[PDB]
Curated annotation (Swiss-Prot), chain A:
It comes from Homo sapiens (Human). This is Peptidyl-prolyl cis-trans isomerase FKBP11. It comes from the Eukaryota. It is a single-pass membrane protein. Residues 23-110 form the PPIase FKBP-type domain. Keywords: Isomerase, Membrane, Rotamase, Signal, Transmembrane, Transmembrane helix. Its EC number is 5.2.1.8. It is found in: Membrane. Belongs to the FKBP-type PPIase family. The gene is FKBP11. GO terms for molecular function: peptidyl-prolyl cis-trans isomerase activity. GO terms for biological process: chaperone-mediated protein folding. The keyword Membrane applies. PPIases accelerate the folding of proteins during protein synthesis.
UniProtKB/Swiss-Prot annotation, chain B:
It comes from the Eukaryota. Belongs to the CCDC134 family. GO terms for biological process: angiogenesis; embryonic hemopoiesis; embryonic liver development; placenta development; positive regulation of MyD88-dependent toll-like receptor signaling pathway; positive regulation of Wnt signaling pathway; regulation of ossification; regulation of protein glycosylation. Residues 169-191 form a coiled coil. This is Coiled-coil domain-containing protein 134. It is linked to Osteogenesis imperfecta 22: An autosomal recessive form of osteogenesis imperfecta, a disorder of bone formation characterized by low bone mass, bone fragility and susceptibility to fractures after minimal trauma. Disease severity ranges from very mild forms without fractures to intrauterine fractures and perinatal lethality. Extraskeletal manifestations, which affect a variable number of patients, are dentinogenesis imperfecta, hearing loss, and blue sclerae. OI22 is a severe form of the disease. Keywords: Coiled coil, Cytoplasm, Endoplasmic reticulum, Glycoprotein, Nucleus, Osteogenesis imperfecta, Secreted, Signal. A motif (Prevents secretion from ER) lies at residue 121. The gene is CCDC134. It is found in: Endoplasmic reticulum lumen; Secreted; Cytoplasm; Nucleus. Residues 166-197 are annotated as: Disordered. Interacts with TADA2A. Associates with the PCAF complex via TADA2A binding.
Swiss-Prot record, chain C:
Keywords: Acetylation, ATP-binding, Calcium, Chaperone, Disulfide bond, Endoplasmic reticulum, Glycoprotein, Hydrolase, Hydroxylation, Nucleotide-binding, Phosphoprotein, Sarcoplasmic reticulum, Signal. It comes from Homo sapiens. This is Endoplasmin. Transmembrane segments: none annotated. The chain holds residues 25 to 283 of 803 of the full protein. Phosphorylated by CK2. Its main location: endoplasmic reticulum.
Curated annotation (Swiss-Prot), chain D:
Expressed at high levels in placenta, liver, muscle and pancreas, and at very low levels in brain, lung and kidney. Expressed in skin fibroblasts (at protein level). Belongs to the STT3 family. This is Dolichyl-diphosphooligosaccharide--protein glycosyltransferase subunit STT3A. It comes from Homo sapiens. Despite low primary sequence conservation between eukaryotic catalytic subunits and bacterial and archaeal single subunit OSTs (ssOST), structural comparison revealed several common motifs at spatially equivalent positions, like the DXD motif 1 on the external loop 1 and the DXD motif 2 on the external loop 2 involved in binding of the metal ion cofactor and the carboxamide group of the acceptor asparagine, the conserved Glu residue of the TIXE/SVSE motif on the external loop 5 involved in catalysis, as well as the WWDYG and the DK/MI motifs in the globular domain that define the binding pocket for the +2 Ser/Thr of the acceptor sequon. The chain holds residues 606 to 655 of 705 of the full protein.
């Protein structure tokens, strides 16, 4: 896997009025795993992870996979090694040069409406 | 690694002495109710500081397995990430239940610490000295790394234990106590000549 | 935990009839008492004592975590003097077993000289001292050792003249890049002990101040058993 | 009433004039019938997690 692969698992319930874009604050649930099935980390039993798109708070492939995501949508991203943890890996949980898979659900999206602020 | 980084290893261990000294100091406190209140401040202050520290390192783009953090802005962040996380391991091991309630719930906190733990594990800081096991132990405790068969948190005891339905030792305590009560009664009767029924 | 279910408040309990007053303590605990101290007042007072102290614990932890220690490494003098007291303690212990331990310098004191003009700080102690081999091994290769090595936080280069009972006086000098050990030109000037000449950084000029060094000695080394002398 | 003269309100207070049920409470209060009935076996119960 040399390129980011993104698959839509669940379509959004209503037509996507506000697709995710850079700068938006996203609340997401995710499950990251290695290609062999070992779970790296999952947020499904926790509060949603809050990230701002463009701030490099998650691995590059995951941030790219969240672009244009819609509320209620679920995606699976297969992320090549150079867009995840690279040559260094993420010890003790992710070996070097590992391809990773993330299942993500967009729970809420807070771009603030300029009028609403 | 870098010679200054080697100096940092002495610096980090030096902080550990104060961190453990305080860790004992917190143990001296008795009330749990105060204990959680300060401990919660430990997590919020430490993790929020950690969030800034990771952002500082992210802007620096300095490899963990690399030359000693030199610029003071990143270098202090390196001190915060490694030193605070090491103290976080002590807090987690000493107070497993308290941290898990206030830490596991938040995904951001777990992810942020996970970045720090790998960041330390690539630097090699927890490879030498008496604090190198701390990185392995904390990851196992938090479930980031597989728990060893012999790895048991000494502090993680079940203080609730089980209802002391079996109290033969306490039954003996009851007997001896009532027995002393019985002995005094006889001694009272002794005195001298009493009246006769 | 054992059970769930927290009661609410009965905003309008008062109307209930033929029921006993469930608030005597609360009301009576605040009644103005002439020639007496109000119950509520005493309670508040102790609360201030206990609660205030508890806040201090947060204060202490806040500093330790939120600080940068090495950035604000004014403790470097504490580390340097603390070693000097420790070495004097070590030689004192050796002296009891062996008379020759104190032969070089019986007097156990620390002498501090400040040279602002040359950016140099000289700390002289009459402690156990160090041999040439120990200078290369202990000092040439670092490692806690932080007590001596804290000086580099505010100092670019450290010069150490050390004389131990088992060896002649030797000088170890390092700039943190390389270290050289040579026999002392002056010989056993100390007799025994170590004198450290510190090549301070530009930022460390304040430490060179006579008042600043004295303040640091009071701040961190006031409890040293051995007398401390500051150049004046 | 006349029969209850032995009962003095101050006896149930701490030396400082306080009504407390904790370790600092008056000895008479801790050993009175009502205190035992309410708190029998209640020590080992966890009312709150915190």
């Amino acid at each position: 896997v040399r390129t980011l692969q993104v698959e839509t698992l669940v379509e959004p319930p209503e037509p996507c009025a506000e697709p995710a874009a850079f700068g938006d604050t996203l609340h997401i649930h995710y499950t990251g795993s290695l290609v062999d099935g070992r779970i790296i980390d999952t947020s499904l039993t926790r509060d949603p992870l809050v990230i701002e798109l463009g701030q490099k708070q998650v691995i590059p492939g995951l941030e790219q996979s969240l672009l244009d995501m819609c509320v209620g949508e679920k995606r699976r991203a297969i992320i090549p090694s150079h867009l995840a943890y690279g040559k260094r890996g993420f010890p003790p949980s992710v070996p070097a040069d590992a391809v990773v898979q993330y299942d993500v659900e967009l729970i809420a999206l807070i771009r603030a409406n300029y009028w609403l602020k | 690694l870098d010679p200054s980084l080697e100096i940092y290893k002495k610096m980090f261990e030096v902080k550990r002495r104060e961190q453990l000294l305080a860790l004992k100091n917190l143990a001296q406190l008795n009330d749990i109710h105060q204990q959680y209140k300060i401990l919660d401040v430990m997590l919020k202050g430490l993790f929020k500081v950690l969030e800034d520290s990771r952002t500082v390192l992210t802007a620096a783009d300095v490899l963990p397995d690399g030359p000693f953090p030199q610029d003071e802005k990143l270098k202090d962040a390196f001190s915060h990430v490694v030193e605070n996380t090491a103290f976080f391991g002590d807090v987690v091991l000493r107070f497993p239940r308290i941290v898990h309630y206030y830490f596991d719930h938040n995904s951001n906190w777990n992810l942020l610490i996970r970045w720090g733990i790998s960041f330390c594990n690539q630097t090699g800081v927890f490879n030498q000295g008496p604090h190198s096991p701390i990185l392995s132990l904390m990851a196992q405790e938090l479930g980031i790394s597989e728990k060893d068969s012999n790895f048991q948190n000494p502090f993680k005891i079940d203080r609730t234990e089980f209802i002391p339905s079996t109290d033969p030792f306490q039954k003996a305590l009851r007997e001896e106590e009532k027995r002393r009560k019985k002995e005094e009664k006889r001694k009272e009767i002794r005195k001298g000549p009493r009246i006769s029924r | 935990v054992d059970v769930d279910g927290t009661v609410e408040e009965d905003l309008g309990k008062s109307r209930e009839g033929s029921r006993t007053d469930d608030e005597v303590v609360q009301r009576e605990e605040e009644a103005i008492q002439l020639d007496g101290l109000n119950a509520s007042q005493i309670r508040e007072l102790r609360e201030k004592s206990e609660k205030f102290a508890f806040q201090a614990e947060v204060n202490r932890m806040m500093k330790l975590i939120i600080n940068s220690l090495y950035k604000n490494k004014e403790i470097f003098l504490r580390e340097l003097i603390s070693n000097a007291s420790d070495a004097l303690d070590k030689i004192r212990l050796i002296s009891l077993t062996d008379e020759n331990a104190l032969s070089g310098n019986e007097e156990l004191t620390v002498k501090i000289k400040c040279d602002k003009e040359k950016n140099l700080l000289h700390v002289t102690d009459t402690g156990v001292g160090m041999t040439r081999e120990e200078l290369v091994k202990n000092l040439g290769t670092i490692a806690f050792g932080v007590g001596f090595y804290s000086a580099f936080l505010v100092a670019d280069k450290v010069i150490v003249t050390s004389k131990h009972n088992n060896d002649t006086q030797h000088i170890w000098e390092s700039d943190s890049n390389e270290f050289s050990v040579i026999a002392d030109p002056r010989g056993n000037t100390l007799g025994r002990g170590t004198t450290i000449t510190l090549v301070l950084k530009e930022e460390a000029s304040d430490y060179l101040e006579l008042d600043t060094i004295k303040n640091l000695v009071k701040k961190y080394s006031q409890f040293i058993n051995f007398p401390i002398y500051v150049w004046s | 009433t006349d029969t209850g003269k032995h009962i003095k309100e101050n006896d149930y207070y701490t030396p400082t004039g306080e009504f407390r049920v904790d370790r600092e409470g008056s000895p008479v209060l801790l050993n009175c019938l009502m205190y035992k009935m309410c708190y029998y076996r209640f020590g080992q119960v966890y009312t709150e997690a915190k």
